[PDB]
Design a protein around this ligand. Structure first.
Ligand SMILES: *[C@@H]1O[C@H](CO)[C@@H](O[C@@H]2O[C@H](CO)[C@@H](O[C@@H]3O[C@H](CO)[C@@H](O)[C@H](O)[C@@H]3O)[C@H](O)[C@H]2NC(C)=O)[C@H](O)[C@H]1NC(C)=O
Ligand SMILES: *[C@@H]1O[C@H](CO)[C@@H](O[C@@H]2O[C@H](CO)[C@@H](O[C@@H]3O[C@H](CO)[C@@H](O)[C@H](O)[C@@H]3O)[C@H](O)[C@H]2NC(C)=O)[C@H](O)[C@H]1NC(C)=O
Ligand code: NAG
Ligand code: NAG
Lengths: 185, 189
């Protein structure tokens, strides 16, 4: 089972002091009986709920194979490494919650393909580079928080970004724009 | 945390004859988790920072309280369909500068729409219909960069609609006290 393999790969790359992934047994037919994983009626993964789990380590690109994933909750851990680009394949995702971690590297432009996304909270990490403009195309976006990162450059105010205020962008490296204090060169 | 004291003060200052805020308790004082209280949505599941208050149709009365300044991360305020009175506080945008949606419709708010509403720079929606608001519509409303929705119908507003607000339809200004100008009928004709 491809979804089970992807989650076993993730387990292999996570460091799990409290053994919250103990039930993640790769030999099973699917991951639907595993704690912190929810499957729908057709035995496909719709949630991964791993907040406050004392996890460290890094994510893996195989997460992008969870094609019916609706909720990815990995908030309040100590996960390092980049946000994989392959997360932009998760087109049924409504909540992407990676906040309160140590993610570094850029926000991938591929997150602009998540057209059903309502919650994007990547705040409290060390993400760098520009806010991808493709995020303004996500018209379902209700809550955006990119605060407490090391982002820089221009902050959009068009598309879905009309709903967002300096609260979403505060305490970054060098953001500029009308929504921020400083205007851009 | 400031957000817990915001809700404590809001409950203490409003009049609540049907006990609709009875379920709001604060067992750990200022450190109580308030994100599951009715009417409350939080930014995230790790802090008490409130993004929106939806207290619509709760039979609440009294004046809009100063305690809201302690909910400083708030972007959506819906107090519609209650029995609130007094005026729209002129401090409201200094209390809540990050407001995107302000819905105070279906209350009994009097006085005029304060000119300090312009200080809510990020306002997309200003919904004030079915109150007892009087005087002129301040032309400061044209300077709200993001204003996509404006609902001022069923008030006691008078004078000429500012020409900049004519992008909004007639339904937005109807049922007022001899209010005139586009999109409504021409003044005196
Ligand atoms: C996300 O990151 C930000 C930035 O570090 C965190 O904000 C900071 O939170 C700490 C609390 O651990 C603040 O210290 C406290 O300040 C308040 C005054 O606001 C004071 O009453 C307390 O006694 C304490 O000194 C800190 O000032 C604040 N801001 C900064 C720029 O450091 C935020 O809390 C993080 N989110 C989470 C959920 O941890
Ligand atoms: C919000 O505003 C921004 C900037 O005004 C818009 O981003 C821009 O979107 C256009 C398409 O509408 C992009 O242009 C296209 O570029 C591709 C690749 O070079 C080309 O194949 C197309 O023919 C077209 O020229 C442009 O790159 C992009 N600007 C960026 C990324 O900085 C955005 O679309 C607006 N969003 C909404 C929802 O209004
Ligand atoms: C995600 O989709 C892209 C094509 O857009 C593909 O290159 C990539 O292999 C996919 N990733 C995964 C993990 O399936
Ligand atoms: C109050 O504190 C206790 C003990 O830490 C906690 O279990 C409980 O959930 C808290 N309740 C609220 C409403 O904050």
């Amino acid at each position: 089972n491809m979804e089970g393999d992807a989650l076993h790969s993730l387990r292999a790359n996570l460091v799990d002091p409290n053994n919250v992934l103990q039930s993640w047994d790769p030999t099973l037919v699917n991951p639907c009986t595993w704690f912190h994983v929810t499957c729908n009626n057709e035995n496909s993964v719709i949630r991964v709920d791993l907040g406050n789990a004392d996890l460290s380590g890094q994510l893996v690109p195989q997460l992008g194979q969870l094609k019916n994933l609706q909720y990815l909750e990995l908030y309040s851990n100590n996960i390092t490494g980049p946000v994989p680009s392959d997360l932009g394949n998760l087109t049924n995702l409504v909540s992407l919650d990676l906040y309160l971690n140590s993610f570094t590297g850029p926000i991938p432009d591929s997150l602009g393909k998540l057209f059903k996304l309502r919650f994007l909270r990547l705040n409290n990490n060390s993400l760098t580079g520009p806010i991808p403009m493709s995020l303004t195309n996500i018209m379902t976006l209700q809550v955006l928080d990119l605060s407490n990162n090391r982002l820089s450059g221009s902050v959009p105010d068009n598309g879905s970004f009309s709903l967002f205020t300096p609260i979403s962008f505060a305490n970054n490296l060098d953001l500029c724009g009308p929504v921020t204090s400083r205007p851009c060169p | 945390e400031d957000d817990v004291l915001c809700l404590q003060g809001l409950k203490n200052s409003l009049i609540d004859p049907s006990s609709r805020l009875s379920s709001w308790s604060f067992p750990n004082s200022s450190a109580s988790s308030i994100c599951k209280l009715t009417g409350v949505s939080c930014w995230n599941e790790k802090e008490n920072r409130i993004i929106s208050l939806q207290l619509q149709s709760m039979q609440l009365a009294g004046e809009i309280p100063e305690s809201l300044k302690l909910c400083r991360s708030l972007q959506s305020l819906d107090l519609s369909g209650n029995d609130l009175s007094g005026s729209i506080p002129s401090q409201i945008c200094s209390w809540l500068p990050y407001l995107v949606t302000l819905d105070l419709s279906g209350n009994k708010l009097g006085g005029s729409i304060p000119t300090q509403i312009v200080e809510c720079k990020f306002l997309n929606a200003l919904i004030l219909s079915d109150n007892k608001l009087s005087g002129s519509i301040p032309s400061q409303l044209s300077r709200l960069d993001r204003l996509r929705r404006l609902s001022l119908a069923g008030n006691d507003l008078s004078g000429t609609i500012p020409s900049e607000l004519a992008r909004f339809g007639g339904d937005d200004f109807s049922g007022n006290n001899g209010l005139c100008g586009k999109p409504l009928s021409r003044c005196g004709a």
